[PDB]
Homo-oligomer: A and B are copies of this chain.
Amino acid sequence: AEVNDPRVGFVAVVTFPVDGPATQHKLVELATGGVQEWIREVPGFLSATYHASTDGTAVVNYAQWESEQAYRVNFGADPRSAELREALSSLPGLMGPPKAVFMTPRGAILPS
């Protein structure tokens, strides 16, 4: 969705500390892999965008949700998200556990 789409009521920014670019690409490919296709139909899910920090030390997901309940229950209570957590957590190269910051969009500066 557009960064300022008014449907976005809740964002999760999740950072995975990784040992380098190879693991960045390996973490990227695994979490956008095709097997994770059920997230696409999760109700209230708006988007998950994965990024590679420029210094090769991290993968950051900026995820857009309709609400905190959508993220917490619709996605989170589903057994497959537990499956997903372990998977990304067992990846060689991860240098620690992901760190998540939860937030609400409050204002946007866009071009006219």
Contact = CB atoms under 8 A, between A and B. Distances in A.
Contact of A62 (B3, B32, B52, B55): B3
A81 interface: no
Interface in A67-112: 68, 101-112
Q: Interface on chain A toward B: helix, strand, loop, or mixed SS?
A: strand
B13 A49 contact: no
Contacts of A54: 68, 102-104
Nearest to A110: B47
A32 B104 contact: no
A69 to B, nearest CB: 13
A64 interface: yes
* A2, A36, A68 interface centre (most CB from chain B within 10 Å): A2
Given A13-B60, A101-B60, A102-B54, A107 B1 contact: no
A39 B109 contact: yes
Contacts of A62: 3, 11, 13, 62
